[PDB]
From a paper:
The primary function of major histocompatibility complex E (MHC-E), evolutionally preserved in humans, primates, and rodents, is to present a short peptide from the signal sequence of classical MHC Ia molecules (VL9) to NKG2x-CD94 receptors expressed on natural killer (NK) cell and specific CD8 T cell populations. Yet, in specific circumstances, MHC-E can function like classical MHC Ia by presenting antigenic self and foreign peptides that are recognized by T cell receptors expressed on CD8+ T cells (Hansen et al., 2016; Joosten et al., 2010; McMurtrey et al., 2017). Finally, structural analyses revealed an altered configuration in the HLA-E α2 helical kink region primarily involving E152, conserved among structures of pathogen-derived peptide-bound HLA-E but absent in published HLA-E-VL9 structures.
The HLA-E∗01:03 heavy-chain extracellular domain and β2M were crystallized in complex with the HLA-E-restricted mycobacterial epitopes IL9 (IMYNYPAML) and Mtb14 (RMAATAQVL) (Joosten et al., 2010; McMurtrey et al., 2017). The HLA-EIL9 and HLA-EMtb14 crystals diffracted X-rays to 1.7 Å and 2.05 Å, respectively. More specifically, the E152 side chain in HLA-EIL9 and HLA-ERL9HIV complexes protruded toward the N terminus of the peptide-binding groove and mediated inter-chain hydrogen bonding with the hydroxyl group of position 3 Y. Although VL9 peptides contain a highly conserved position 3 A that projects into the shallow D pocket, E152 repositioning plus the hydrogen bond formation with the position 3 Y side chains of HLA-E-bound IL9 and RL9HIV redefines what can be accommodated at the position 3 anchor.
Residue numbers in the entry:
A (entry chain A): 1 to 275, 277
B (entry chain P): 1 to 9
C (entry chain B): 1 to 100
């Protein structure tokens, strides 16, 4: 199927406490594989997936140099943005950057993203044409003009379409045993009576990978649902994910409800009901 | 790998 | 300056069986700015040696973090997550419910 290489960079200024904090994380699909944190005397890019230890010192030295340089650029960018918005040096501000590429089933470039956010809001985005920009205000229009002056969109295309695609293929090969292994969800239904007249049916999906999943409570048209709840997909902590969906139904109608679970790791969708 | 030198804002 | 309050889930890595080693998780997501304080509590007392994941964020730029520690659930021990954020007037406490 499709695969993605994505980097997430955060820089947060610290008034009167030195240089901004800078944290970079890299993901292949839903698996984090690298991290850089500048809160160290000699900060290093480090592996966060064991299969990345197949990479030699040349790789880590190069990524460490890139991440250290990127942190400096973001410190400059925070100073520039503060001036664009006439903001004082006493406030903490956040600059975020997400970038990467998506491969199609053919292994070819499918889509790329390059997006900046300032204080939690879109700031400057490279459009899907990989040649025009979206600036959100007059400040971002200055940044857009500077990127156009420097032909940044063409340098982005070269990375997103070639460098990014080439290295995503390499990472997928180095970690194929885990990255390409689909782990289906383990599913069950639990029953929790609320009162004498109503009960909660909770449909569980545990230990699946990747994170994309659909949990749906279906009913036969004769069910009278009192309430529903679907929690955000959450990490189990071991590389897999969890999710559940609940419905509050009148006691005695439990058998009118069926939980439907769809996940790439299942050969076919699973249907569960509450059986004491 | 990371991209080198995002153009300054 | 945007502010988004954290969504909080407290849960275990594996279905809780009394007397068996497990992992207690506190997942905070959807928050902004990134500064946040998270502690795991056993019977109201702060658990030491609690680790957390590397700061990352979602498509809408909101941050997420996982805080976790090894634990062994019992019948009477109460576990909880205590979260402090700029959007919270006081630190919020969410008790662990083994069925959620």
């Amino acid at each position: 199927g499709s695969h993605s290489l994505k980097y997430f960079h955060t820089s947060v200024s610290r008034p009167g406490r030195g240089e901004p904090r800078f944290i970079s994380v890299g993901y292949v699909d839903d698996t984090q594989f690298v991290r850089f944190d500048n809160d160290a005397a000699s900060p290093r890019m480090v592996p966060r997936a064991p299969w990345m230890e197949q990479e030699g010192s040349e790789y880590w030295d190069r990524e460490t140099r890139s991440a250290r340089d990127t942190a400096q650029i973001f410190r400059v960018n925070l100073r520039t943005l503060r001036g664009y918005y006439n903001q004082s040096e006493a406030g903490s501000h956040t600059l975020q950057w997400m970038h990467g590429c998506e491969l199609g089933p053919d292994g070819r470039f499918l889509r790329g993203y390059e997006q900046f956010a300032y204080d939690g809001k879109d700031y400057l985005t490279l459009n899907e044409d990989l040649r025009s920009w979206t600036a959100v205000d007059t400040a971002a229009q200055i940044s857009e003009q500077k990127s156009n002056d420097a032909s940044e969109a063409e340098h982005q295309r070269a990375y997103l379409e070639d460098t990014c695609v080439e290295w995503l293929h390499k990472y997928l090969e180095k970690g194929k045993e885990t990255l390409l292994h689909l782990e289906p969800p383990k599913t069950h239904v639990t029953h929790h009576p609320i009162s004498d007249h109503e009960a909660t049916l909770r449909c569980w999906a545990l230990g699946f990978y990747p994170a994309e999943i659909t949990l749906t409570w279906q009913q036969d048209g004769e069910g009278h649902t009192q309430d529903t709840e679907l929690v955000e997909t959450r990490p189990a902590g071991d590389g897999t994910f969890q999710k559940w969906a609940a419905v509050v139904v009148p006691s005695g109608e439990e058998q009118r409800y069926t939980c439907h679970v769809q996940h790439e790791g299942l050969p076919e969708p699973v249907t569960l009901r509450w059986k004491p | 790998i990371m991209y080198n030198y995002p153009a300054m804002l | 300056m945007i502010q988004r309050t954290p969504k909080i889930q407290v849960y275990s890595r594996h279905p809780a069986e009394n007397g068996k080693s497990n992992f207690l998780n506190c997942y905070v997501s959807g928050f902004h700015p990134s500064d946040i304080e998270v502690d795991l509590l056993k019977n109201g007392e702060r658990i030491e040696k609690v680790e957390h994941s590397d700061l990352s964020f979602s498509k809408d730029w909101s941050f997420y973090l996982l805080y976790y520690t090894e634990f062994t659930p019992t019948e009477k021990d109460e576990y909880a997550c205590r979260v402090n954020h700029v959007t919270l007037s006081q630190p919020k406490i969410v008790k662990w419910d083994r069925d959620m």
